[PDB]
Design a protein around this ligand. Structure first.
Ligand SMILES: CN[C@@H]1CCc2c(ccc(O)c2O)[C@H]1O
Length: 280
């Protein structure tokens, strides 16, 4: 009753769902001119990142786990690691960009038009992707993330193994850039938005519960998917024998699933429902 035929089906289902949802979202945005909006360009960038992550990094990792060997060379292992880091950080930063856009829309409605236009959004997205690619491709391809202990060199020399060993400085300065700062920004933004919504409800009740569900769906999903992995990412370098490799791999694959839940969270507007109904 091997797991090769058991977990493989689950991995295939994950890949199919991730590809299909994001392809549908991108086609719906592109085909119909009624959905082209400044707030929809960030969703397009997020969907592109999720599509690349579901097409490139996931199948090769699944093959590596099931076959238990890395047939390809060292160059493709490095390329795969770089693409993985790039696609994770781009998505996690686009989420914070969306949150800040919503904050600026809600808080200052008179000047919202001037702050965000078609000119600024393109530059913002390009800057996000450039910063994403500056921390992923450059340090990995210039060999600055490597370690010093003997097992790291033994893994590096052999061309039939692809395992992730990292240095302390790279791990800390990568987690800080990729996860914690956007988390703080999103927390502050959504706290302000919730306060404004509560004030408006109080005003209406003075003149004459529904926001907690949306805030939870937006935030708890991201926190539960990505917070556990980065804690052990920080811990495992400091403590040599406090984290096993299997737990690290499992917590890493928990995070990949988060790319499939984005269409359900950010793309269930009635206009999007009409677009999906017309397409299929
Ligand atoms: C092999 N998986 C990698 C390992 C380290 C790492 C990831 C994602 C974002 C980062 O900032 C990282 O440092 C993971 O996707």
């Amino acid at each position: 009753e091997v797991w090769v035929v058991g977990m493989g089906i689950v991995m295939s289902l994950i890949v199919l769902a991730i590809v299909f949802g994001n392809v549908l979202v991108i086609t719906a945005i592109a085909k119909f001119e009624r959905l082209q909006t400044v707030t929809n360009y960030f969703i397009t960038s997020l969907a592109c990142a999720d599509l690349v992550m579901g097409l490139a990094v996931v199948p090769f990792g699944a093959a590596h786990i099931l076959t238990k060997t890395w047939t390809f060379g060292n160059f493709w292992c490095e390329f795969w690691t770089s693409i993985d880091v790039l696609c994770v950080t781009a998505s996690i930063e686009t989420l914070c960009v969306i949150a800040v856009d919503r904050y600026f829309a809600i808080t200052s409605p008179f000047k919202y038009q001037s702050l965000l236009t078609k000119n600024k959004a393109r530059v913002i997205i390009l800057m996000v992707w450039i910063v994403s690619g500056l921390t992923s491709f450059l340090p990995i391809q210039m060999h600055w993330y490597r370690a010093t202990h003997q097992e790291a060199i033994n893994c590096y020399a052999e061309e039939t193994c692809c395992d992730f060993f990292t240095n302390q400085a790279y791990a800390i300065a990568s987690s800080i850039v990729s996860f914690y700062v956007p988390l703080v920004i999103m927390v502050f933004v959504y706290s302000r938005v919730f306060q404004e919504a509560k004030r408006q409800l109080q005003k209406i009740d003075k003149s004459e519960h529904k926001a907690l569900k949306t805030l939870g769906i937006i935030m708890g999903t991201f926190t539960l998917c990505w917070l556990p992995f980065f804690i052990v990412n920080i811990v495992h370098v400091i403590q040599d024998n406090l984290i096993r490799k299997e737990v690290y791999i499992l917590l890493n694959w928990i995070g990949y699933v988060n790319s499939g839940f984005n269409p359900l969270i950010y793309c269930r507007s009635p206009d999007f429902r009409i677009a999906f109904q017309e397409l299929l």
